[PDB]
From Swiss-Prot, chain E:
Family annotation (PROSITE patterns): RIBOSOMAL_S2_1
Molecular functions (GO terms): structural constituent of ribosome
Gene this chain is encoded by: RPS2
Assembly: Component of the mitochondrial ribosome small subunit.
Keyword field: Mitochondrion, Ribonucleoprotein, Ribosomal protein
Family (UniProt): Belongs to the universal ribosomal protein uS2 family.
Species of origin: Arabidopsis thaliana
Chief localisation class: mitochondrion
CDD domains for this protein: RPS2 (cd01425)
GO biological process: translation
Name of the featured protein: Small ribosomal subunit protein uS2m
Subcellular localization, as worded in the UniProt entry: Mitochondrion
Recorded superkingdom: Eukaryota
Cellular component aspect of the GO annotation: mitochondrial small ribosomal subunit
Curated annotation (Swiss-Prot), chain F:
Subunit description: Component of the mitochondrial ribosome small subunit (28S) which comprises a 12S rRNA and about 30 distinct proteins.
Similarity remark: Belongs to the universal ribosomal protein uS11 family.
Function as written in the Swiss-Prot or TrEMBL entry: Required for karyogamy during female gametophyte development, when the two polar nuclei fuse to form the diploid central cell nucleus.
Organism lineage string: Eukaryota, Viridiplantae, Streptophyta, Embryophyta, Tracheophyta
KO phenotype (gene knockout): Failure of fusion of the polar nuclei during megagametogenesis.
Compartment(s): Mitochondrion
Gene: NFD3
Protein name: Small ribosomal subunit protein uS11m
Length: 62, 38, 99, 66, 195, 123, 100, 44, 100
RNA sequence: UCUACGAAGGAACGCCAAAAGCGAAGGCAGCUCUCUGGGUCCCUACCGACGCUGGGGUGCGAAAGCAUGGGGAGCGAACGGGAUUAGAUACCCUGGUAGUCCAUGCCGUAAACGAUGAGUGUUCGCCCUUGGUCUACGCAGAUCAGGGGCUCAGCUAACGCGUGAA
């Protein structure tokens, strides 16, 4: 869908949940920089954010 | 090949299930109808 | 050091509770020459997964925000928090561009 | 992955089940690292050989794009 | 001048950048490069003169082509013109391939002429004239080996190992017009020349 | 609603089936060695799981449950589990009416979210 | 030696006998050019910065930006009147090309 | 000339002592607990 | 609004206003932040800031310090044979000592 | 055994993920925070030749090893048995301490391996790509730092490199 551009930067923070729950896949895995269209800096920020939230117990683990 | 062997072992579920041989699996001529495939 | 302190609390129980519990920090940061801005809550939120199987209380937890700025060591005071009852996941992070 | 068997379909069920799970990458994990053990040396070496497998197969494909 | 107008109409000076030379490019246009059409014409001057002089001793020529878009344009020549052999023109139709131009006196005896041609003619061509892209490479190599001069169309695409051991380069650059009448200039030449 | 679970635990040279309530109460078990002449060199096969699931199908048919979430928890190619579920349905059904399926299906192979020094390689 | 002068020196020092293309080879030298460096200059029509943005709108302007630059010495934003003139020519040309 | 950049940096640092922080919309800590105020957003 | 000044001395991490301050003390003209003695003073206060809060295990950062002090030795080694007056000034005001 | 919930602990950090990235080298990753080194881009301001290398010397330097005090899940030298063989100190199985881990100290070595000292200038391109910058008008074009292939040439006993092995 439409969460593919650089807007994700403004809209990618472990407090927010929908922009990000869009990324964790079916079985609870982060999806590649290929599975979507997104940049490298981006994917790294998303990785920090999903791991922070998940450690905060804010997002799933399986 | 494949239908032969699969329907074969499934027929053999007879010797699996009934003690050794109750030929209620006399029914197994369909596997032959597909084995005669050339 | 403009920190936003999220607080993931145990269930709704003790309404006039967590408010005074964070009032503790309110006095903390009044003292120590700190500064608060805005204390917005978010109400119920369903947790991802069954945290803290001790005492349980891992579905539908409470969340608040404190949004202070203060002395650095404030994290090594906040280590006063962790064993608090209702709070589960005190998290003081940073001020970021995102609201 | 979870699925209710739609009114005893049980084969289209498995179809979407697999397809979704496999695509989820998780399959590429449970078939992935489970073996006896690997150290850093063997790890880097197998990574290098995976890279070479992929570069060879991509050469074949880029050839087969006409 | 007016001829330069005509070349410029001939969709020729412009061709994509696949280059080893830059002595030629008037510029570029992001999808084309513009060569110096005056240099084009000057190359034609020199080489066409050379062929019209070699005429004055009547030395065999033996054109070469493999991309059969010019086939008709060229076939109007090399039979009753230049080499003058239509039967050899048929070799040229189906040639360049085998043991070539240096082991020209090969046996090649085995025909079994079932839906094959198998010409194999043999005489030293004192000059060569080609036009195609790259499959013909054997002719260039062997000419450079045995000291045979060559006229050749070169696009930006030419490896140094050809661009430097082929004399007389006609940097014509066939492009969007594809194959258009050129050889009619050398058709003018060698006929109403040999007096 | 309320329903049992039947669990199947593929392993290296052994696998088991445990038929239990929703809240984990072992009612009917079967080891891939709990069959006549299917242990020893016999332990390492996929027909092991085949026979196990079909036998447990006949058993959990004799007791007519028919509303039992079936789960597989092991580390394999999906082909092995496909064949084992087909076998379980076989044993369940082909001594009963034509259709005697499961109410559900669901998968659970918990991944070790990190390492614990899995033992060294064989030689 | 080069393919043209090697051979001359060869035959002159009497190595091999003369080829049948020599008198003409010298009479028609190869077309040499001044040895120049790299840097194939990007050559541009002076009317670039608007055709890109105008064919966006709607060839003939690809050259009519010249008939606009001619007054472009005191052109504030005459892009609007230019596209207007283009409207005019397209209107009349398509009236004609629908009357045909 | 670069006095201009002097000015530019001093200004960008002034920004009315950062009006965002100089704002009247602040939060007194000795106060009636804007926490207690939060009953609407308490369920936000 | 009285919360302006309760934004000081405690909401602070960098505290590299001291660099600006001392660089000022030692700066000749305005926006002149790149002369030799100036860099010397900045290195000096940096060394005195960093020789306190490192745990005798942050060895990389210690190496940073070592490179700092020896580049400072280089700075002074050149400083001494250009403007000797300013160099005595340097040692006097900065507490460093001479060893030809 | 298994099967559900718990508790204890230890140990490493699944996916991301990467011929990606950071470091002088050895090396470095679950997360958050304080402190902290070096870097590149950037109109560019200053400053002014202060640079490069570097004998004897100085620090850093994985793993194993040592010392003292912790900890010890799993792994697992030594060793025990099951084995296996003509024989078996072994490979195969099951046990299993030292060791792995933390605290501080000691060593100071590795295929410490691009098997390629350090630095400066000049060199045909294409493909990429990490992060900067300028320019944007359907979209990129440009410019820097790097990391990675492929090549013109050049070199090489041969392979090959071409961020050089020019």
């Amino acid at each position: 869908s439409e969460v593919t551009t650089e807007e994700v930067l403004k809209n990618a923070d472990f407090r927010n949940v929908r922009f990000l729950a869009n990324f964790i896949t079916e079985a609870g895995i982060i999806i590649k920089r290929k599975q979507t269209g997104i940049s490298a800096k981006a994917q790294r920020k998303i990785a920090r954010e999903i791991k922070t939230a998940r450690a905060f117990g804010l997002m799933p683990f399986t | 090949a494949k239908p032969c062997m699969k329907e074969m072992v499934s027929f053999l579920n007879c010797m699996a299930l009934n003690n050794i041989k109750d030929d209620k699996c006399e029914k197994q001529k369909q596997l032959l109808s597909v084995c005669m495939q050339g | 050091p403009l920190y936003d302190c999220m607080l993931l609390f145990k269930p709704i129980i003790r309404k006039e509770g967590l408010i005074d519990l964070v009032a503790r920090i309110g006095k903390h940061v009044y003292s120590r020459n700190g500064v608060l801005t805005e204390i917005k809550s978010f109400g119920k939120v369903e947790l991802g997964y069954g945290i803290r199987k001790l005492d349980g209380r891992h579905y539908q937890g409470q969340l608040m925000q404190i949004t202070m700025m203060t002395t650095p060591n404030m994290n090594k005071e906040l280590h006063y928090l962790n064993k608090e009852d209702k709070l589960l996941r005190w998290l003081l992070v940073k001020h970021r561009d995102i609201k | 992955i979870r699925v209710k068997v739609f009114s005893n379909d049980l084969d289209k069920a498995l179809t979407i089940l697999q397809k979704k799970m496999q695509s989820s990458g998780m399959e590429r994990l449970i078939k992935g690292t489970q073996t006896h053990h690997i150290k850093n040396s063997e790890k880097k070496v197998l990574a290098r050989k995976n890279l070479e497998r992929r570069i060879k197969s991509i050469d074949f494909a880029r050839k087969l794009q006409s | 001048v007016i001829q330069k107008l005509l070349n410029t109409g001939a969709h020729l000076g412009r061709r994509a950048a696949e280059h080893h030379f830059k002595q030629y490019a008037y510029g570029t246009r992001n999808g084309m490069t513009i060569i110096d059409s005056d240099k084009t014409l000057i190359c034609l001057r020199s080489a066409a003169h050379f062929v019209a002089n070699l005429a004055h001793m009547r030395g065999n020529i033996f054109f070469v082509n493999t991309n059969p878009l010019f086939d008709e344009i060229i076939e109007l020549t090399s039979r009753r013109i230049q080499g003058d052999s239509y039967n050899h023109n048929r070799a040229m139709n189906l040639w360049k391939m085998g043991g070539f131009l240096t082991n020209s006196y090969s046996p090649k005896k085995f025909r079994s002429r079932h839906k094959k041609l198998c010409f194999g003619p043999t005489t030293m061509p004192d000059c060569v004239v080609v036009f195609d892209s790259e499959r013909k490479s054997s002719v260039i190599l062997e000419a450079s080996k045995l000291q045979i001069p060559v006229v050749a169309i070169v696009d930006p695409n030419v490896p140094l190992e050809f661009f430097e051991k082929i004399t007389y380069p006609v940097p014509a650059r066939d492009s969007v017009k594809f194959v258009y009448l050129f050889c009619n200039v050398i058709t003018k030449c060698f006929v109403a020349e040999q007096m | 609603t309320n329903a049992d679970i039947i669990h199947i635990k593929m392993l290296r040279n052994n696998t088991f089936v445990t038929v239990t309530d929703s809240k984990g109460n072992v009612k009917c078990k079967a080891t891939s060695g709990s069959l006549p002449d299917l242990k020893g060199g016999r332990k390492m096969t996929n027909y092991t799981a085949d026979a196990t699931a079909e036998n447990i199908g006949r058993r959990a048919k004799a007791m007519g449950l028919k509303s039992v979430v079936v789960k597989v928890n092991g580390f394999t190619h999906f082909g092995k589990k496909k064949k084992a579920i087909i076998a379980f349905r076989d044993g369940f059904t082909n001594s009963r009416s034509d259709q005697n399926p499961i109410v559900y299906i669901e998968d659970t192979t918990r991944k070790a979210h990190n390492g614990c020094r899995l033992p060294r390689k064989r030689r | 030696g080069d393919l043209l002068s090697k051979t001359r020196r060869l035959v002159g020092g009497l190595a091999t006998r003369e080829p049948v293309w020599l008198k003409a080879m010298e009479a028609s030298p190869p077309p040499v050019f001044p040895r120049s460096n790299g840097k194939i200059q990007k050559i541009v029509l002076p009317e670039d910065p608007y055709v890109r943005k105008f064919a966006n709108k709607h060839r003939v302007y690809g050259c009519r930006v010249l008939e606009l630059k001619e007054h472009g010495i005191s052109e504030g934003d005459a892009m609007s009147v230019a596209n207007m003139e283009y409207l005019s020519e397209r209107k009349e040309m398509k009236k004609a090309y629908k009357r045909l | 000339e670069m006095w201009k950049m002097m000015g530019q940096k001093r200004e960008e640092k002034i920004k009315e002592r950062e009006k965002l922080l100089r704002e009247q919309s602040s939060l007194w800590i000795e106060q009636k607990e804007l926490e207690r105020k939060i009953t609407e957003a308490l369920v936000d | 609004d009285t919360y302006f000044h309760p934004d000081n001395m405690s909401s602070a991490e960098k505290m590299k206003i001291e660099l600006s301050k001392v660089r000022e003390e030692f700066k000749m003209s305005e926006s002149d932040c790149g002369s030799a003695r100036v860099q010397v003073a900045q290195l000096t206060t940096k060394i005195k800031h960093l020789s306190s809060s490192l745990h005798k295990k942050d060895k990389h950062s210690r190496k940073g310090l070592l490179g700092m002090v020896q580049k400072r030795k280089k700075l002074l080694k050149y400083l001494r044979r250009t403007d000797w007056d300013s160099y005595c000034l340097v040692l006097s005001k900065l507490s460093l000592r001479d060893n030809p």
